[PDB]
């Protein structure tokens, strides 16, 4: 039972659902509980004097703000959800979130399309860290955009491929996918001409028939003279296995940005780390 916090009827529904689930063993999720900091305290006291069913679970989704009571934080286990640390982690999360049966479907090219989608999503989400240069503002390129892009890819591939096991890369509706991602899915958030130009950059560079060649490069001159190579596989597990063997030497050149873009940031955080190590002394 999912309940959104904020209204009196919401509090009544939350109380009723928790009271039912602590006996039945069902699950209760409460969303945006940070908007009612006072009620969270009575919720914590109610939870403390309670011996619910074995399978009962209570999830409280919230934003990271100081209004959340400290006692509630101590009473429960905290999980922080944020952008993945790097391109490899982002692509691994993307592949884990999408079901295996979805990627492995009638056309074998769907797996490579999904891999391209994951790489694209990882690149644009990782460029958000270098906010002045990677983009012009902190766009909210998130998981909903990834779902919309996956749905678009599925719909247009199914339309083009009437259940055929294999289709030619030139027959893939590249223009439809590129336009829908540059105008509706990812371009909807973009409110700048130059950010739109950069999105069109990435979409034209990545989504093309040339992405199905063995000589395709995902990125160029990442460090020195080597470059990221497009995997030659045709199955989802092979793409995931390629993602697992990423060098773990990510640089902003992976994103197309200059390598020095992180030099200030990686400096500040480093100094920041010292400060934290000094604050806990």
């Amino acid at each position: 039972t999912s309940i959104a916090i904020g209204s009196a009827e919401g509090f009544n529904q939350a109380d009723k659902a928790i009271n039912t689930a602590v006996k039945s063993g069902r699950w209760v999720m409460l969303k945006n509980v940070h908007l009612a900091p006072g009620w969270l305290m009575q919720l914590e006291k109610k939870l403390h004097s309670l011996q619910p069913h074995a399978c009962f679970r209570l999830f409280l989704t919230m934003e990271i703000n100081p209004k959340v009571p400290v006692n509630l934080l101590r009473a429960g286990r905290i999980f922080v959800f944020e952008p993945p640390p790097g391109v490899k982690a982002n692509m691994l999360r993307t592949f884990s979130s999408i079901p295996v049966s979805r990627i492995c479907k009638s056309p074998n090219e769907r797996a490579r399309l999904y891999f391209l989608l994951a790489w694209f999503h990882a690149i644009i989400q990782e460029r958000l860290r270098y906010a002045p240069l990677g983009w012009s503002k902190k766009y909210e390129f998130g998981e909903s955009d990834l779902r919309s892009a996956c749905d678009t890819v599925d719909t247009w591939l199914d339309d083009t491929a009437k259940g055929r096991q294999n289709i030619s890369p030139d027959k893939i509706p590249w223009s439809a996918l590129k336009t829908l991602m540059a105008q509706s899915i990812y371009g909807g958030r973009v409110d700048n001409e130059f950010d739109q130009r950069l999105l069109n950059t990435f979409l034209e560079r990545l989504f093309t028939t040339r992405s199905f060649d063995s000589e395709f490069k995902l990125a160029c001159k990442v460090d020195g003279h080597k470059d990221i190579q497009m995997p030659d596989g045709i199955r989802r597990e092979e793409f995931v296995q390629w993602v697992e063997l990423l060098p773990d030497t990510q640089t902003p050149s992976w994103l197309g940005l200059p390598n020095n873009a992180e030099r200030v940031l990686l400096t500040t955080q480093g100094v920041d780390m010292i400060s934290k190590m000094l604050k806990m002394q």
Binding site: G6, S7, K31, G142, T152, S184, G188, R189, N192
Partner: protein
Amino acid sequence: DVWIDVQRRWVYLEGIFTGSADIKHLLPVETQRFQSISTEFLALMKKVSKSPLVMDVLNIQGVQRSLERLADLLGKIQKALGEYLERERSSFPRFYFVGDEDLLEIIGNSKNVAKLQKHFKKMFAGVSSIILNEDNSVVLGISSREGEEVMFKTPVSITEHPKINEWLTLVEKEMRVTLAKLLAESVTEVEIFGKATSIDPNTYITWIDKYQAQLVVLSAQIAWSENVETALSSMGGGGDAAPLHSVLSNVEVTLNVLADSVLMEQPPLRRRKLEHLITELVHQRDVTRSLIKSKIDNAKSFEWLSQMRFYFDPKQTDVLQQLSIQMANAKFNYGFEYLGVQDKLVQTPLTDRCYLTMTQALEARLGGSPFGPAGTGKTESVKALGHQLGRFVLVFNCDETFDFQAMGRIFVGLCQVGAWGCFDEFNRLEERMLSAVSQQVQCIQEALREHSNPNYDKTSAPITCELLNKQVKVSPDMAIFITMNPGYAGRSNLPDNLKKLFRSLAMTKPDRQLIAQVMLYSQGFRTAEVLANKIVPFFKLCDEQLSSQSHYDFGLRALKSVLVSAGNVKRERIQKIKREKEERGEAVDEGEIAENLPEQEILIQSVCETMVPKLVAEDIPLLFSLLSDVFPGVQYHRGEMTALREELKKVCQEMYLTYGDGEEVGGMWVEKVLQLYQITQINHGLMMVGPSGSGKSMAWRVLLKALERLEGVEGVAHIIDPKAISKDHLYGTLDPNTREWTDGLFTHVLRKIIDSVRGELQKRQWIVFDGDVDPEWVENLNSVLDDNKLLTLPNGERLSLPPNVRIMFEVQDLKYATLATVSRCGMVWFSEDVLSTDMIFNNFLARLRSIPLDSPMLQIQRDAATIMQPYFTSNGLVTKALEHAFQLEHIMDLTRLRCLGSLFSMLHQACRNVAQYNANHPDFPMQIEQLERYIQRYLVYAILWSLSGDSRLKMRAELGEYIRRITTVPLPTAPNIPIIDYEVSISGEWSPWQAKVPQIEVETHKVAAPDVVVPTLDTVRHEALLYTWLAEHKPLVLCGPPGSGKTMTLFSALRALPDMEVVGLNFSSATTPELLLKTFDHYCEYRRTPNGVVLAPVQLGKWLVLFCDEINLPDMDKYGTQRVISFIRQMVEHGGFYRTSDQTWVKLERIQFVGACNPPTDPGRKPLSHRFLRHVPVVYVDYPGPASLTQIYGTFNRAMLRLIPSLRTYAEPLTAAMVEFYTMSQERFTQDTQPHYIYSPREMTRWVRGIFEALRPLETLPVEGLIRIWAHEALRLFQDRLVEDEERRWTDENIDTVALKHFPNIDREKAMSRPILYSNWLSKDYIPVDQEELRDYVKARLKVFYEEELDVPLVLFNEVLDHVLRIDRIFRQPQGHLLLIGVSGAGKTTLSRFVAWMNGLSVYQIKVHRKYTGEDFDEDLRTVLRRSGCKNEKIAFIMDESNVLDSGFLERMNTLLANGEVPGLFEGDEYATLMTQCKEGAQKEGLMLDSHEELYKWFTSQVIRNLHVVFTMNPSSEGLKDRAATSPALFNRCVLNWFGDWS
């Protein structure tokens, strides 16, 4: 608790069942039940009314049981009626868009269809009325607001379907099927018009006239889509000759025909159809050109699927599903909702991108979220897409009152009807409301997703969603759209879960050039391309080059307004050329007229009419240079609107205003008036921006009167101060319990205009918002000030703005308004240079010569005006004096009209003085020479007191010296005495003020009494000035340091006016107009005179002076507005306010306001609004100087020391010792260190009073004892509030130093034994007490205290003895309140209780708990006030800072501390009970009082004499500063004792 509920239920149910005489035919069984209920009700009315006694009816048996049965019956019948309303809403779901009372109105009025014709506008998109035959028995068709009608193929017969829901559903279905059939026929014809080399204009115009505006555009789109699809299917072979060029040429020739058509005169409906067709075919031409350039040869290429394509299948049996609209992979079926004649937008690249994104969102069964700055056309694009699919789109202007329940019911209506909800400003909701609404949105979207599954079949169970604990059917055609402006003020943050439910789209840069080009081309402008390419860069360069002003807007709305005005101007110029040709010759050729038409000149005229009025002076040359550069060689000269100009002349003459043409005096004002008229003609939302007193109000009033006298249409203006009332009182409230809507002020006015019972729609209605503008209240008018012209309320009601209504704002700035409001309003900028000072002088002189002040009075006024005319000219005495005074320093911001109004009031007082002289001397009236001398000297005097009255002495002297240098009036000849020290005698000669200051001898028993003033120069000057300002009833403000004597001066001046009764109000940080309303309820009454409701004081013949103690304390909101200050400004400038009980204008009579305040630079004080300060002269009362203080307290000391003759020679030194030390401390301890370190003559007054009390009983006393008393009082005054030890050491040392300096030959030890203790416990008199004897006495009294009262043992040290002595000192004084500041657990409460027990006071402490509220505090306050004011019981009310749970606690306590009464505490039966007990108490005392006013005065006096409030709080740094503003009386009415921590 049962009778009232049953009574109300029966009343409203009887009203429902009687107003609807046909409701019985559909509700039979409950009709019989209600007949039985009515018979029972008649039985009760026939039984209880015979005996009008409660005891006579509570003795009758069978009453309570029958009442309970009736209550149950009423509840059951109400529930049944609610279920019936729900069931009837289930069929024909459009009834979800009407209220329950409205639904019942249609239910009961099914027989007569005339009453139902006003409900179709809110149940249908474009159906305004239903066409019926003469019998009113069959529905022949439908009609729109524009008059376009659709004739049903098969009319709906009401006789064959008597039930309302059935024939309404049949009407809707017949609407859809008739629209489908007409669309099919129009498509059949336009196909013939298609695939043709040439098009006959006559046949095309005939086809356009035949079909509706919706259907012609739809058919053109269908034909073009079919042609393109056929061409692509032919070209699918690849590398083949393209017949797509044939489609492009067909579009081109049709565009040529349409462009030729719009050049010539057309009927308005045909012209709008031609414009829509031109726009659509221009878009088609652009799309075809893009397809040709891209070499698209496949119909399955995305360059063709990304477009909106229309497929028509005549083979479909269902005409509703006959048309399909497809964009990318999204498919929709045309809703066939009659939309009337809407304004089509230009399909720009952004619009296309918006269409694609929103259609993708719709296919995903999730909402759309277009975001961006205001004026990007986010809302219009959503409405245009909805109209493209034939959907019913409702726009809801959302605010924070759109709570969970309102949004839920809106969603229920949208689900049932199957309509599109465009929620504009969705971020104006609360974040918690956004989160709550996210759940409903998710449920609806999940239901839609389940509907879209192919496994579902329409024959199975319908899809329902859980909305508001109910199963609600969800139509597949529902859509939710939310347009929000990210970054604006008053906007909230959307939760992530809600954001994931919408597909967002950035609409930031509209394609302005394309819009301009297409709009100008559709209006008939030849060379529209060059016009657009000139006018869009012009707007961009105006945005870049011009200075940044808060009222500047050069976005799309501005260009849109410019383009619409350009089209209107072109039509008017064509008509003018036509009539000129008719009167000169007979040859008329419309093609020639179009050919030789200066289109660029028309565009320049439009730009000047729309952009120029808002420009500031420094930006006008820049914009005109931009015009000369972008449009070179073309010039526009504004037409001379003479016919309005003579009307303006006549109105100005009748209103004593100055009129000018061009460069004469007042010409700029008339130019601004004409600009305002043009903006009214072009805009339905206007705003008049400019500094206070720039002539805005007179401008729009004169324009209204001139328009009434020119057009013959009577003009009615409703003036509202939006920030003088709460937003709930402005727009309305929705009851969270009963879902009942109470209209606000603006809502009530608009609804009354719309109903037009008294012919309101036939009058020019102007709703002016004269007040501050912030996004909290003005954004609710967004949909009002937009194309929607609609006010949307949370209860789902939508009110359309009538065409005769203009929404106007009169503001002084827009620094807090967002761009959303600025862009939706035409701005007229009123600089201070528009209204010259000569204009104000002319107005004043004309009013003086015309309006009598009380005809001999008018003759005196005319003579005085003739005498003072030479000084009121340009570069005259007054003008130069004002210019110089603007260079001085004043206690408040100096505005021209404040000084000018002060001067005018003083001149009116001078005329009244001359009239009084003439009345006093009937034999010898004042002659012309004496009058001339008096008027000139008084003019100089009034200039001095009006232009420097709010300044210090040195500024006043500087202004006097400047006037002396520049004036020619005979002035006082003293080499060193400033002119400000003289007054003007009625004989016409300067006389020094010192002659009015006599050395008085105050009576011995009246030493330092509250109403005893020692005459001083400032006292006699300020008294005269206040008398002058009060006699005219002009509101005034006294500014100065606390304890400067503002209240004393005001009361002294009012003593000379016996016809005025003063009422004290003490403002604080949380003061709101409800305090004023309570004061009005207590002291005044409302009566309904034939002219309206008038609020006047109860005491006839008396003027009520509402004296506000701290007028600048009330808190400003985050937009720099004090609500109470705006309320007072409205009551002063408009002479009344609005009663929010019934939204009625109440006019004040015999009520005037006086304010007092500390300087605005003081902590906790805010500067007053310039629009408020314009009407209130400000007088600066400074602290008395050493000479004046020496005189005032020297007099009090002599009167005091007259008690002991042997000490009579020590009055002069003692006063000096009083004056010096008080000075030193005032320099040593300032508000910079601690907030409470405030020293004023008030401390010295207490000093003299305390020494006088000490000296009253003594028959004799040596000098050493007098010095000891002086030092003890100095310690109790200057040392008790000190925080640090070093400050108290300084106080001791300098007390000794001052005493030794002023009393050399004394015994130091006998007078300054450091334990200086005084008490009247050991003896009858207040003689000094020894520390050891005092300790023993306190020990014995503490033993008795333990035995009788609280038994907590106490340890006695010296500080305890000092503190109990101080508390005993305070409890022995009238209105003696304490503020003990110290650490918790230090014994403050215990010592206070012990001292109260010793003095016989009854200790009262409020018992605060978790459920303690304001009502409990009010009840406790009533209890204490009754006990201490009616029973004559001395009560020590002990309150701790932790007992406070709200600011209302501090408000009530502040009022009680300052005045001794709360004006609104006793209201209702409580007031009657209080009056009864007060009469009983007065009879007990021996006073026979009859009226409630004098009895309430006696009650207040008893409370003041008895109640002692002891406030205890911990010593917080910021807490004390906060309390100094929240409760000022805690620091001016309470004695502060700093106990601190134990030393």
